[PDB]
Write a protein that binds this ligand. Structure first.
Ligand SMILES: *CCC(=O)Nc1ccc2c(-c3c[nH]c4ncc(-c5cnn(CCN6CCOCC6)c5)nc34)cn(C)c2c1
Length: 309
């Protein structure tokens, strides 16, 4: 029965391949660029414990995907293998490349992306915009917030040590697990070979130009230093509990303003020290920004000294 055999040579890796009859597909987790992502229960994911079920996220390839799309999803899966596992990244768990459509299985983070996780925990009052959630959750302590930043910085320190550049580090690309662990998504994506549209929103309405370092805006240069710039924007997102960068600023104006030295103002509830860290990440000169190793050390100290009261 050649019915439904792929015309392509999809790479079977015995360490990672899972029979798809071990997956019980559940609710949707949203549209990715390559296709749906769906929650599933995987049976015997760990060969040590074959009778146990694990919740996982299954990245699928849409039926009308192109060959570039297929190649990009394979490239991300292979890059995840080379980068290796870390607590603060979305890890590869397995793949289904035989006997049906391509599935790439990655970790499930039940609380969803960090922007909406923080927005649902906004308290009332003057320091934050309103809470948009119809299921609002308990507010985080100051220490929790700095610990969110620390965990993302630790994940980025790991990725940079593996020579992985993220290129779109933003609160919407951080997921939060049931145990409130921060996990960076999309670090393994292959870079587009075509020029980008600065004015095209993501499927979730975001304008990624607002996280771009000026050398990426102006000259399309991305380094670990430009990821540190983005991390500064992510810091501002954290201390506004999910705010939208550059409020009121039209995107066509952003490079002119940045070039003239405009930077976002300090959020109302943010220490001078954390605002200085944000501003250091936004140094005009890439060589003068802190490294992720340095951000990790400083945030570790700040977490220790920040009240959870
Ligand atoms: C092209 C790049 C791309 O498509 N990237 C991409 C990467 C990962 C994911 C996911 C994904 C992976 N792992 C996940 N775990 C959980 C979730 C998730 C989605 N919604 N929720 C629930 C949020 N609610 C909020 C209200 O209270 C209950 C929880 C969890 N998503 C995960 C998903 N997608 C689309 C991509 C794309």
């Amino acid at each position: 029965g050649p019915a439904g055999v792929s015309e392509y040579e999809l790479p079977e890796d015995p360490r990672w391949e899972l029979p798809r009859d071990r997956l019980v597909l559940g609710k949707p987790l949203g549209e990715g660029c390559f296709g749906q992502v769906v929650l599933a229960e995987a049976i015997g994911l760990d060969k040590d414990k074959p009778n146990r079920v694990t919740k996982v996220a299954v990245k699928m390839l849409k039926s009308d995907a192109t060959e570039k799309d297929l190649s990009d999803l394979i490239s991300e899966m292979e890059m995840m293998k080379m980068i290796g596992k870390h607590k603060n990244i979305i890890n590869l768990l397995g793949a289904c490349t035989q006997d049906g459509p391509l599935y790439v299985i990655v970790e499930y983070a039940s609380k969803g992306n960090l922007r909406e996780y923080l927005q649902a925990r906004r308290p009332p009052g003057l320091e934050y915009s309103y809470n948009p959630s119809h299921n609002p959750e308990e507010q985080l302590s100051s220490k929790d917030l700095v610990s969110c930043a620390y965990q993302v910085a630790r994940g980025m320190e790991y990725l940079a040590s593996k020579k992985c550049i993220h290129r779109d580090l933003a609160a919407r690309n951080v997921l939060v697990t049931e145990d409130n662990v921060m996990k960076i998504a999309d670090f393994g994506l292959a870079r587009d070979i075509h020029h980008i549209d600065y004015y095209k929103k993501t499927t979730n309405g975001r304008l990624p130009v607002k996280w771009m370092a000026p050398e990426a805006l102006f000259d399309r240069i991305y380094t670990h230093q430009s990821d540190v710039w983005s991390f500064g924007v992510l810091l501002w997102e954290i201390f506004t509990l999910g705010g939208s960068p550059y409020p009121g600023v039209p995107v066509e104006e952003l490079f002119k303003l940045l070039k003239e030295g405009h930077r976002m103002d300090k959020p109302s509830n943010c220490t001078n020290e954390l605002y200085m860290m944000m501003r250091d990440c936004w140094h005009a000169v890439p060589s003068q920004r802190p490294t992720f190793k340095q951000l990790v050390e400083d945030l570790d100290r700040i977490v220790a000294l920040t009240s959870n009261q």
